[PDB]
Design a protein that fits this description.
alpha/beta; TIM Barrel; Rossmann fold; 3 domains; six-stranded mixed sheet; 33 strands; binds a molecule of 9 linked components (NAG-NAG-BMA-MAN-MAN-MAN-MAN-MAN-...); binds a molecule of 8 linked components (NAG-NAG-BMA-MAN-MAN-MAN-MAN-MAN); binds a molecule of 6 linked components (NAG-NAG-BMA-MAN-MAN-MAN); binds a molecule of 4 linked components (NAG-NAG-BMA-MAN); beta-glucosidase activity
């Protein structure tokens, strides 16, 4: 009954004919073939926590002029530096339903990363997907929906990598919550567990939901993946061969490299054989001075436990990702910041406190990304309710209410890793953040607008001030705009009992009681919500005194300007909620696991709900919805008509057959153990730094590993060291990453007309849903969408395609995608429940 993860070996090696990777492969081959074993180990092993400048860094190869590779957070900003931008969070980006904006954000991020000397930007995020709305880090990702998220991953990645930086799809996989993600962190919170939470996911659910968006990332050409902290069926993701070897590298033919999350790598030989390619930040645990790779990897190659073909492939994947995005060994942008301090001068080697020099150049990489940020946040703002009060036009009297309207009195970067819920909520907390160059609060932008218009403007920037608030908002003609929030983030930070994950789905800082009080005192109350995910609006949303409600998510640096643009109709809102607003906590049907459920061993997160999370659950159970997935209003109206479906002629879905090549080796290495000894007369051994060298020619003593001495055959599973040609999986694509290319054959083109039946120009977000028709299938699933500009009175065409994959189901008996015999239907409309146009697939 304890969930089990099958062995899948050997770890697949790169394919020289993989489309998109052919040129990268050859550049990697020419480079890797020149390398000594120590130099290959330098590539694969991080230099340690705090070792130099970036969040993580590899060893350098200074013989060939390769500077150390810089791995830097975050998905929405370059973390821990200055003169960068802070972009809107993934969840706000997802809410745009706008491919172009997703690409532009990705590109701008990559430009900032490139300008700092970053090699790999640690984003975007398809895990967590959003199994449960209390998930602390859901806001870093995109949507609960696998299609929207998959598209957002692909667009973001294409942008970042077009800007010349490697992207990293994380976290792979099943890190849906922060509770019990790490042993030490759990123990310091009073949870005595010996291993991290295990996500136990059935094969169908894996293929149709959690894996799906990462496959889109693979097909978009993502250079790297990050394996998760958590386990999958009680094997840690970074040594999980089912995950890394089979699903990622075999079935979906991934050609890039897998890096560990920071302290997610727990074993040397076992992880490498299971598909891990880079150990970040390089040490066993932060500041340990030791590594599961480094010296140990050198020794494992020297003693035979790790084959040469395997380490050669790790270096090939790392270098091929580097070359794929256009980085060169000659013209590397120097690392021009230090993560560990904003000081211009300090130790290059931070943990060791050595090599004092200039470590921050304070390079301005912001360009004109401010206005792009302002635009994305406005387009990802969801108008949930409007009885006529919006847009605002020369109002007599604005009363802006709430702490979330105002500044953090200690400044927008006053708290490390954004760990306060003081002032306006620009982004959440944790590693998925960066330092603001500024943070425009609603109060600043709304005042300036009011003064320009001759509107009266007063604000009370506290949630608990009923005397003052009542006296203000109860006056004649007041338009009360109440800003309220909820917050969440990464598990290393805790605010008021919220350990990463949210304890509840209410507003913070007495937000709910504030909104009830203001709406009881003022019949023109407008509520703006800054939240990482849904909160329960049930007790107050239906008050007619609340004339409008907006969810503005995590807008990033231009918050105040974005919301003012929407409030006054400079942007006509089109953004759609990328999750469901349920009536209760229980209506969601999933929740965070807050208490260990397996004694002192690994807690078990059984995904018994299957694919029925968010709107799939709400539709199937008919649970209480306030606002459905894909819902959002505009200041105009739209009419749907004229649905048409054109059937395409396609060939049969043919199983992929044949063999891989035998695993190649690139270059050779000396057999003299003395050649691998630490070169002490060349440079000093730096404290806590992670090196490839042995301390002496005694291999056993050099390991410092009390269990040293066993061979692959007695501690790894069968075929872990098998470098012979391997049969291809029928679901794989021959030379085609992302699965059998026949999956992406277009089977239908769907079209419909959209007419703007109101007075003003606006964007519409038509959506395409499919009913796959089986009794265990969701009622409808998202399969396409667009964002289209329509003038008053104008008619525009929505056009979208359905691939074979889009109408298939994973058949676990077959281990492939099948189109089931059940009648499928197509729906098109402005939301998951406004299914205006319907037609059966012909
Ligand atoms: C879901 O999860 C959420 C996240 O975890 C969770 O959110 C949390 O909710 C809790 C509970 O609501 C929040 O904590 C509460 O915060 C309240 C507000 O605190 C601030 O304001 C107070 C009152 O301010 C007025 O009075 C002051 C002096 O008298 C003046 O200085 C002010 O200017 C202000 O005056 C105005 O209002 C007056 C009337 O109120 C009016 O006459 C006057 O004219 C004017 O209009 C301040 O006192 C308070 O200051 C404290 O804290 C600050 C730190 O910020 C310190 O600097 C101060 O020294 C001081 O200690 C804040 O600025 C609090 O009122 C509330 O306190 C009460 O409850 C706590 C419970 O722990 C008691 O310890 C405390 O003694 C109080 O008890 C009394 O009332 C309660 C409630 O009715 C009652 O049960 C109890 O028996 C007793 O009667 C509390 O601290 C918390 O902030 C939220 N967290 C986050 C992170 O946002 C949410 O609840 C969850 N939801 C669910 C459903 O599970
Ligand atoms: C976490 O744990 C999860 C739970 O265990 C786990 O999910 C499981 O994932 C594995 C794959 O990793 C699945 O294994 C398959 O099992 C198939 C049999 O499944 C039936 O029996 C099971 C046992 O009783 C049932 O549990 C299962 O029920 C599930 O599905 C039902 C609906 O179908 C549903 O009602 C249930 O509720 C439940 O959800 C089901 O009834 C088995 O067929 C399959 O074998 C193929 O694939 C293997 C590779 O894994 C091959 O080794 C094997 O040889 C088979 O492939 C060959 O044959 C196929 C057709 O028969 C061909 O299509 C293939 O191409 C292939 O053909 C080769 O051989 C031919 C000759 O024989 C030759 O001609 C060809 O050329 C070629 O060489 C596989 O073992 C398992 O079912 C999943 N279970 C569930 C519940 O989801 C999850 O993966 C774990 N996650 C992690 C991260 O570890
Ligand atoms: C050459 O040099 C190298 C480098 O110095 C030397 O390398 C060292 O070699 C020693 C052995 O001499 C290694 O110690 C051994 O490690 C193994 C693996 O430990 C890790 O994985 C455990 C889980 O194992 C399963 O899954 C992995 C894949 O993830 C797979 O490799 C295994 O075969 C096993 O597979 C089974 O389960 C799979 C998943 O479900 C299935 O798919 C599969 O079918 C199988 O059913 C895990 O438990 C372990 O976790 C512990 O340790 C980590 C720290 O590493 C800690 O974080 C955890 O909390 C746990 O405490 C690891 O992650 C391990 O299995 C061995 O343990 C057995 O044997 C010892 C006796 O030595 C017993 O005490 C144990 O109880 C158990 O029976 C053993 O610990 C060492 O890791 C390795 N060092 C490095 C840096 O790589 C090598 O020795 C040299 N060789 C020569 C000839 O010189
Ligand atoms: C695997 O990856 C690792 C990690 O990247 C590699 O390890 C590094 O290798 C490089 C090059 O082989 C080492 O750099 C050399 O460092 C020595 C020693 O410098 C230290 O000690 C000096 C003597 O006391 C001292 O003067 C130095 O201080 C100056 O420099 C620092 C650093 O920039 C600066 O902050 C200070 O203010 C000082 O200005 C320092 O404390 C150094 O002597 C070497 O200089 C060579 O080149 C210069 C010209 O560039 C030349 O003038 C010299 O004569 C000399 O030839 C060089 O900088 C580095 O120290 C290693 N890093 C660590 C952490 O140990 C490893 O090499 C990779 N292996 C493989 C196989 O690829
Ligand atoms: C090659 O790999 C092997 C493992 O395969 C590796 O051996 C391991 O090294 C670690 C780190 O040095 C050892 O763990 C340490 O043990 C000492 C006690 O003797 C502890 O002080 C350390 O505790 C840390 O974590 C604690 C939290 O629980 C903290 O309280 C404390 O402050 C420390 O931060 C730590 O547990 C481990 O015992 C060995 N394992 C084996 C099997 O020998 C070896 O170091 C690698 N070699 C190289 C050269 O990198
Ligand atoms: C919607 O907002 C309006 C204000 O725009 C609210 O109307 C106000 O309701 C209060 C409470 O009933 C009235 O206040 C006073 O109540 C005392 C009771 O002791 C009474 O004696 C006073 O004469 C006075 O009525 C207030 O007059 C009234 N204001 C207006 C302008 O009508 C309304 O209650 C809100 N509704 C909801 C459902 O939130
Ligand atoms: C809030 O309530 C006031 C009355 O308390 C409304 O004021 C009326 O507005 C209409 C126009 O819609 C005028 O013709 C009336 O003369 C106004 N009456 C008074 C007594 O001022 C106000 O419209 C309400 N606001 C909203 C947003 O519905
Ligand atoms: C944690 O549980 C283990 C048993 O797994 C026990 O031996 C240990 O004492 C516990 N930890 C603490 C700090 O009490
Ligand atoms: C706001 O700042 C104060 C420090 O002045 C801090 O104690 C408090 O926790 C912060 N509030 C929140 C909600 O993070
Ligand atoms: C709401 O109003 C009531 C009574 O008018 C007051 O006692 C309570 O403290 C107020 N709450 C907030 C958050 O303003
Ligand atoms: C679903 O619930 C709604 C009320 O929320 C109800 O009107 C409708 O009939 C229900 N549909 C079912 C059970 O199919
Ligand atoms: C290797 O030498 C360093 C001193 O430079 C020491 O701190 C470290 O523990 C040694 N490692 C082993 C495995 O003995």
């Amino acid at each position: 009954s304890l969930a089990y993860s099958e062995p899948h070996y050997p770890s697949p090696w790169m394919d020289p004919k993989a489309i998109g990777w052919e040129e990268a492969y050859e550049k990697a081959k020419a480079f890797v073939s020149q390398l000594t074993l120590l130099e290959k180990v330098n590539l694969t092993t991080g230099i340690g926590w705090g070792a130099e400048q970036c969040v993580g860094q590899t060893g350098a190869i200074p013989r060939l002029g390769l500077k150390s590779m810089c791995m830097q957070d975050a998905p929405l900003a370059i973390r821990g530096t200055d003169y960068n931008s802070v972009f809107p969070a993934g969840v706000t980006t997802a809410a745009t339903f706008d491919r172009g904006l997703m690409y532009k954000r990705g590109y701008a991020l990559g430009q900032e990363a490139k300008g700092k000397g970053v090699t790999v930007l640690l984003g975007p995020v398809a895990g967590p997907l959003g199994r449960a709305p209390e998930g602390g880090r859901n806001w870093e990702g995109f949507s609960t929906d696998p299609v929207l998220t998959g598209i957002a991953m692909a667009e973001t990645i294409k942008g970042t990598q077009d800007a010349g930086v490697v992207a990293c799809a994380k976290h792979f996989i099943g890190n849906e919550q922060e509770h019990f993600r790490q042993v030490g962190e759990s123990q310091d919170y009073g949870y005595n567990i010996s291993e991290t939470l295990s996500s136990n996911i059935d094969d169908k659910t894996m293929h149709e939901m959690y894996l799906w968006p990462f496959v889109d990332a693979i097909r978009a050409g993502v250079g790297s993946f990050m394996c998760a902290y958590t386990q999958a069926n009680n094997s840690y993701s970074c040594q999980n061969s089912k995950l890394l070897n089979n699903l990622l590298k075999q079935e979906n033919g991934f050609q890039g490299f897998v890096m560990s999350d920071w302290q997610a790598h727990h074993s040397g030989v076992a992880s490498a054989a299971a598909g891990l390619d880079m150990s970040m930040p390089g040490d066993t645990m932060f500041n340990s001075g030791r590594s599961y790779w480094g010296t140990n990897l050198t020794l494992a190659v020297l003693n035979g436990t790790v084959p040469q073909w395997r380490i050669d492939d790790m270096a090939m994947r790392i270098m091929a990702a580097f070359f794929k995005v256009g980085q060169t060994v000659e013209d590397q942008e120097p690392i021009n910041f230090s993560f560990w301090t904003l000081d211009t001068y300090g130790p290059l080697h931070w943990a060791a406190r050595k090599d004092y020099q200039q470590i921050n150049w304070h390079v301005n990489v912001q360009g004109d990304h401010g206005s792009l940020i302002r635009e994305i946040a406005a387009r990802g703002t969801v108008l949930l309710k409007n009885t006529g009060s919006l847009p605002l036009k020369k109002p007599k009297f604005l009363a802006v209410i709430g702490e979330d309207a105002g500044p953090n009195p200690l400044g927008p970067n006053g708290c490390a890793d954004n760990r306060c819920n003081n002032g306006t909520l620009g982004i959440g907390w944790g590693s998925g953040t960066g330092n603001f160059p500024y943070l425009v609060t609603p109060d600043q932008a709304l005042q300036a607008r009011a003064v320009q218009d001759g509107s009266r403007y007063e604000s009370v920037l506290r949630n608990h001030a009923p005397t003052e608030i009542k006296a203000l908002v109860s006056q004649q003609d007041a338009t009360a705009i109440v800003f309220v929030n909820a917050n969440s983030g990464e598990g290393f930070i805790e605010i008021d009992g919220n350990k990463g994950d949210r304890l509840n789905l209410t507003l913070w800082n007495e937000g709910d009681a504030l909104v009830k009080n203001v709406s009881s005192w003022c019949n023109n109350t407008i509520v703006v919500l800054h939240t990482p995910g849904p909160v329960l609006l049930t007790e107050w949303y239906d008050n007619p005194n609340i004339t409008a409600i907006l969810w503005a998510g995590m807008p990033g640096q231009e918050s105040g300007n974005s919301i003012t643009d929407v409030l006054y109709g400079r942007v006509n809102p089109s953004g759609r909620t990328p999750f469901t607003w349920g009536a209760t906590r229980e209506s969601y049907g999933t929740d965070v696991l807050y208490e260990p459920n397996n004694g002192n061993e690994a807690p078990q997160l059984d995904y018994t709900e299957g694919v029925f999370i968010d709107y799939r659950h709400f539709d199937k159970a008919n649970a209480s919805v306030l606002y459905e997935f894909g819902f959002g209003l505009s200041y105009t109206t739209f009419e749907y008509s004229n649905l048409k479906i054109e059937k395409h002629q396609v060939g049969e879905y043919t199983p992929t057959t044949g063999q891989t090549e035998a695993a190649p080796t690139f270059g050779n290495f000396s057999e003299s153990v003395e050649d691998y000894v630490f070169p002490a007369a060349e440079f000093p051994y730096v404290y806590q730094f992670i090196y490839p060298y042995l301390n002496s020619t005694d291999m056993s003593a050099s390991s410092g590993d009390a269990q040293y001495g066993q061979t692959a055959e007695e501690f790894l599973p069968p075929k872990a060291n098998d470098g012979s040609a391997q049969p291809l999986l029928r679901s794989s694509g021959l030379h085609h990453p992302g699965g059998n290319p026949a999956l992406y054959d277009i089977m239908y083109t769907v079209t419909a007309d959209i007419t703007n039946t109101g007075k003003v120009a606006g964007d519409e977000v038509p959506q395409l849903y499919v009913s796959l028709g089986g009794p265990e299938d969701p009622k409808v699933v998202l399969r396409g969408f667009d964002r289209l500009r329509v003038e008053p009175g104008e008619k525009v065409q929505f056009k979208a395609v359905l691939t074979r994959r889009d109408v298939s189901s994973w058949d676990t008996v077959k281990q492939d995608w099948v189109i089931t015999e059940y009648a499928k239907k197509v729906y098109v409309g402005p939301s998951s429940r406004k299914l205006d146009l319907e037609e059966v697939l012909p």
